[PDB]
């Protein structure tokens, strides 16, 4: 679990969005595994606007942060799950690291701010849904 709180927006994994997220929907994209809902309280997270390919992510299944080198956002084939059929997930960045299903939502950050959230895992890999291109979040 986990979300990004920026301005009047909450960014979550679309497959973990709650009934309240869908009732306050701003934007969603199944191909990116992202959903953004509106909030009444002001969020104070900062979104990075950069081309970093290194950062640190939070892994809830280890209660630890890990440094990672990750690929640029791209279209990656993701196997079928209970949430989606087999498909290409866009704007996805991969790194070598630990990620179990409940780790989705963990933030990846660089020195500029929030880069994205954990969205995929298994096999000693961790995949992050990029949010740096969503300029409207600010």
11 touches ligand A1B38 by CB under 6 A: no
104 touches ligand A1B38 by CB under 6 A: yes
d(CA 54, CA 66): 11
Any idea of the CA torsion for 33, 19, 47, 31, to the nearest 10 degrees?
20
52 touches Zn ion by CB under 5 A: yes
**Are residues 94 and 103 in contact, defined by beta-carbon separation less than 8 angstroms?**
no
Binding segment (CB under 6 A) for ligand A1B38, from list 3-11, 34-42, 81-89, 105-113? 81-89
The answer to whether the annotation marks 112 as part of a ligand binding site is yes
d(CA 107, CA 109): 6
Q: Footprint of ligand A1B38 on this chain (CB under 6 A)?
A: 15, 33, 78, 81, 83-84, 89, 99-101, 103-104, 119-122
């Amino acid at each position: 679990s986990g979300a990004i709180y920026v301005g009047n927006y909450r960014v979550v994994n679309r497959h973990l969005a709650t009934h309240n997220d869908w009732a306050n929907l701003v934007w969603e994209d199944s191909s990116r595994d992202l959903l953004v809902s509106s909030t009444t309280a002001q969020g104070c997270d900062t979104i990075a606007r950069c081309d970093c390919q290194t950062g640190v992510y939070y892994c809830s299944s280890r209660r630890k942060h890990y440094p990672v080198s990750f690929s640029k956002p791209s279209l990656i084939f993701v196997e079928a799950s209970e949430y989606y059929p087999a498909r290409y997930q866009s704007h996805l960045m991969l790194a070598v690291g630990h990620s179990e299903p409940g780790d989705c939502g963990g933030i990846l950050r660089c020195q500029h701010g929030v880069v994205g959230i954990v969205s995929t895992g298994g096999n000693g890999l961790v995949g992050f849904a990029d949010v740096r291109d969503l300029l409207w979040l600010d």
